[PDB]
Amino acid sequence: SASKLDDAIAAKFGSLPIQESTAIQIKAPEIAENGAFVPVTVATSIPGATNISIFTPANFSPMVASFDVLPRMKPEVSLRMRMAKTENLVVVVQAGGKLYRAVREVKVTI
Amino acid sequence: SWSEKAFSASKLDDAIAAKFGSLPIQESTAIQIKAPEIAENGAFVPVTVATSIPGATNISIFTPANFSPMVASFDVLPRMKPEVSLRMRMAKTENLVVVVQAGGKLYRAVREVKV
Amino acid sequence: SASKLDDAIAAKFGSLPIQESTAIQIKAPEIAENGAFVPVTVATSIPGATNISIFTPANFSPMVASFDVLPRMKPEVSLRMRMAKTENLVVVVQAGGKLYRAVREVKVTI
Amino acid sequence: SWSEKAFSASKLDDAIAAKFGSLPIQESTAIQIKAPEIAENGAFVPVTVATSIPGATNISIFTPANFSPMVASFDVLPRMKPEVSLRMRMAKTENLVVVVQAGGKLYRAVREVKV
Ligand SMILES: [Cl-]
Ligand SMILES: [Cl-]
Structure with a gap:
């Protein structure tokens, strides 16, 4: 669960x-x-950001997307994601030698 | 200018x-x-890039003239209809080159910005 | 490289x-x-095997496939894989509380 | 037998x-x-299962009658034309049920073995 996310x-x-x-x-x-x-969109304002990555740690492929960028380009990513079940979208930004994380749950009906 | 084009064209090929x-x-x-x-x-x-090439798994963005030509690279699982936005400062007029990788094949488009 | 494989x-x-x-x-x-x-096929003779998984640690999605099975079913998996560049196929089998690994390189031309 | 079918049918639904x-x-x-x-x-x-359902990402194999119905489960990245082989001991005649997940949808087929 948490171990998997961290491994990814x-x-x-x-x-x-x-x-x-x-x-x-x-x-x-x-x-x-x-x-x-x-529709899912991710963005960041972190000035030194050189990557923004999107994880879905519950899924077979825990990493959905990875956007390498030069710093100061305020990257945004938008995509369409198939929702199987209630899950967390986990986003990580690298800026310098630091990692920054944000998490958002999407509930799914049946 | 022709030679400057020839130069940045070669840089792009290498990248x-x-x-x-x-x-x-x-x-x-x-x-x-x-x-x-x-x-x-x-x-x-402001720049936005998308593609409708089926199994597109990478979108890479090149700015030939500049010291480092590859400005961004987007890896993605296929069929997620990706659109990638970024802002880039530009000291002069230049071409934006996008190469998309899909299957075992590369696809290219280019757009000019005057400045 | 090795760290990534091990993380996966x-x-x-x-x-x-x-x-x-x-x-x-x-x-x-x-x-x-x-x-x-x-064409790639993977198999194992390890009696207690409850999983056989296929990793391509150089790729964006390092895990290609995972076959959960009851023990003694001698699982085999066969698939078609797109070869970008010279890479290692890494296969791992779980049997009990042990992991077993085999590696095979596929060279790619240009 | 009818009731035994009804029983294993319910077990399968649950699984x-x-x-x-x-x-x-x-x-x-x-x-x-x-x-x-x-x-x-x-x-x-010896049992072999494949599928041609486009974005098939899982193949799961069920043996309804037995104490634990789900006998195997194959997760895969899409479009790798997967075929999965296994051997299973069978104490009596039974149905093999395969459910494939593709997109946001489940697909089923069944095959009988007499014994
Ligand atoms: Cl929505
Ligand atoms: Cl071959």
Whole structure:
């Protein structure tokens, strides 16, 4: 669960310190239909950000996307994600030698 | 200018080779690049890139003229209809080159910004 | 590289001991064309095997497949894999509280 | 026998619910199951399963009658044309049920083995 997320994060980023951040914005519907494609957008204001990655640690492929960027480009990513079940969207930004994390739950109906 | 084009064209070839390997590339209308037609001298230019190439797993963005040509690279699981936004400062007029990797093949589109 | 593989393996299996094993068979062509789909088959004779998983640690999704099985069913998996560049196929079997690993390189041309 | 069928049918429903959630399921000819028509009493039966349902990411195999119905579960990245082989001992005649998950939908096929 948490171990898996951390393992996934580590493979992307190595062993860098992680801390929660509100300087990462995640937009997704609060609740979603089983099987529906759902719009998800992620962004960050962290000046030195050189990567923003999206994890869905409950899924077979825990990393959904990875956006490498030069610093100061305020990257945003938008995609459509199929919602199987109530899950957490976990977003991580690297800026320098620090990792920043934000988490958002999407509830799924049946 | 011609020689400056020749220079940045060679730099771009190397970078695409450095990123994807020495793979053949084709031009595509299935890559969407939005940016201002014109922009302010030395300011931030909003850029948006998407693609409708089926099993697209990478979108890489190149700015040939600049010291490091590859400005961004987006890896994704296929069929998530990705759109990637970024802002980039631009000291002068230049082409934005997008290469998308899908299947075992590279797809390219280019858009100019005047400045 | 190695850290990534181990991180990927850990997310699947947890922190179990891993050891190389020749009781895992991997069939793939020695050399492959850039971009080609290539037949790959994996199997194991390890009696207590309850999982066989296939990793491609160089790729964006390091885990390609995972076959959960009851013990004594001698699982085999066969699939078609797109070969981008010279890479290692890494296969791991869980049997009891032990992890078993076998590695095979597929060279790619250009 | 009817009641024994009713029993194992209920067990199967629960297991598919336990594995995939309470999702609707349809029957499919796009699932290929190979096994002997007949087999020896209490011996190993070779089984092969594949599917051609496009974005198939899981193949799960159920043996309803037995104490634990779900016998195997195959997670895979899509479009790798997976075929999964296993041998299973069978004490008596029984149905093999395969459920494939693709997109946000479940697909089912069944094959009988006499023994
Ligand atoms: Cl929605
Ligand atoms: Cl081959």
